[PDB]
Amino acid sequence: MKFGIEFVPNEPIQKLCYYVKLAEDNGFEYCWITDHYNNRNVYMALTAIAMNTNKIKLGPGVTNPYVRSPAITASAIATLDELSGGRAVLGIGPGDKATFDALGIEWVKPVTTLKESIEVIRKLLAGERVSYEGKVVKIAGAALAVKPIQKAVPVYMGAQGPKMLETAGMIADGVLINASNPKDFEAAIPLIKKGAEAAGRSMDEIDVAAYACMSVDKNADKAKQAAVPVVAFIAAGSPPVVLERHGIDMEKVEAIRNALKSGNFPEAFKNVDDTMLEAFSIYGTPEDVVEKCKKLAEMGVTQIVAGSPIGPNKETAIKLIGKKVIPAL
Amino acid sequence: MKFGIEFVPNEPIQKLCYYVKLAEDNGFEYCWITDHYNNRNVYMALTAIAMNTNKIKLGPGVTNPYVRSPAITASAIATLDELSGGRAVLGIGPGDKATFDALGIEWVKPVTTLKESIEVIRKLLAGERVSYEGKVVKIAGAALAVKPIQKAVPVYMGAQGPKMLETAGMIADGVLINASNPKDFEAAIPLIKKGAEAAGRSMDEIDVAAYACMSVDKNADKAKQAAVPVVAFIAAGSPPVVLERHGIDMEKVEAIRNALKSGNFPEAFKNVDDTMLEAFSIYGTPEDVVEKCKKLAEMGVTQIVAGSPIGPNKETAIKLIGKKVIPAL
């Protein structure tokens, strides 16, 4: 089992560089940085991280086709790959309507746009002069001067829905699924396989990654309490099918929704229950978390991403995962 | 007279960082990095430059509203300003049709779009929650979490045309004019002044920058020969009015145009003449260049940007400008 780590660049970049180097020292193999217009710029953060690291793979987790031209995304990735000596990965998903509403961007045909953007990005990274008359993406004579070090930079698709999961099976090197529980992967991974089989691919060529809420502490209950804020947001944002799959109490989900939309975070967290914590986070002592990670592997997960909060104290939790979780997996 | 320096990030970023640190050591006050999708990413380059420098102001020269959301541009600038301790500058212009044709981007109302984008970027950088119903740019509830250190990051507009120059006079902190000869500023600066007066502003609040082709060498003729390739491109791309102002031989301009569009650089360079070099570059010994810079200051130029080639050898020329040009001005 390979481990990744996820951060929002919402603190000074020097602090983030400390966390990622600490993660590298502790045997994490992937560093995923979120890409939201309101925070520190993802590629500037990744440049600093590359300068402070040596071996960990790193990239946006995830960017999207809309906030920058896919041609800009390609050369940003090539730049990262050069600086890092061949360690770049491209995490890319469809984005979200709330963001694009605020920025005045039309969310055109997200599944098609993501596929066409990935094809164009890969052709540019391969050094091709690109003429591409897509249904959405239209390129006429574009060519990079900047070149990656890797022959093919791996592309990980953010995928939550069936059509996106099947598309990832056909074209992606990895899949970032926002889930933490085996039931979710029992359902998701067959859809990826359907796409792999349609494309004549083996699942061996696809890294199925759990983009998980993780909270690890020597005290199981402190780990549980630290996962509550993130789980509140995950439950509030979960589609019906996910809430049905885990038997979540919908009246509690509505209480969380109302509290979050007025910013009453204490009130929202009051409504998180044990069912929600077991469904939407990997939490507990190291021994607890190792067992949970094993049951995800049994469903076909091949990368676990230690996502927020990581633990009650991120510094402490990164070290504890490195000493008593990663070596066991 | 303040000095800037311009680079294309078309080599490994470490080499660029050496040049910019060398420029800082030699008394340059501004560093302008070009923003084109085919090269290394401008903000990744600027991050590395910021880490290798201390005092020089730095930013894109120039970005545009189209290749990234203006909200992304705002947080990229804020991120740069934070990393650099308050040294960011935002160079921004309209872009160009050739690029946007290749990327599938419609070049909507260049002057209006640039004005609205600047207004939005400034409101975002000021910490405002932005609802902006522009003729082109439409923002609904966007807000940054990242903050610059400067209260107002200076905005320099790239401006070549009359409407853009007048707009820059009304709204910009500085103007980047792609010209090297006093005749061009004699014509341009009154248009900026027209806008400043319409907005009730003093020209004291506007840094008029000559975004110049510069070539300095202890041997005047080596300096002249090093300027030929850039001057060939400037002459080929100049609007009629500029070629008319300098009495350029249009037949040589056409020979240059045909050679460049087939990539015959030797043939294009054969057609560059003394008239073109005097009109489109600041070249010669340090003594020559000092006098030429003084005649630009007399027209109202307050920053000279040492643009490509800088000299026959960039390292040698940066040092020579620092020792025998900047101190004299």
Residue numbers in the entry:
A (entry chain A), B (entry chain B): 1 to 329
Task: Cite, word for word, the article reporting this structure.
Methylene‐tetrahydropterin reductases catalyze the reduction of a methylene to a methyl group bound to a reduced pterin as C1 carrier in various one‐carbon (C1) metabolisms. F420‐dependent methylene‐tetrahydromethanopterin (methylene‐H4MPT) reductase (Mer) and the flavin‐independent methylene‐tetrahydrofolate (methylene‐H4F) reductase (Mfr) use a ternary complex mechanism for the direct transfer of a hydride from F420H2 and NAD(P)H to the respective methylene group, whereas FAD‐dependent methylene‐H4F reductase (MTHFR) uses FAD as prosthetic group and a ping–pong mechanism to catalyze the reduction of methylene‐H4F. Mutational analysis of four functional amino acids, which are similarly positioned in the three reductase structures, indicated despite the insignificant sequence identity, a common catalytic mechanism with a 5‐iminium cation of methylene‐tetrahydropterin as intermediate protonated by a shared glutamate. Based on mutational and kinetic analysis, evidence has been provided that all three methylene‐tetrahydropterin reductases have the same fold, similar methylene‐tetrahydropterin binding positions, and the same basic catalytic mechanism; however, the binding modes of the C1 carriers and reductants significantly deviate.
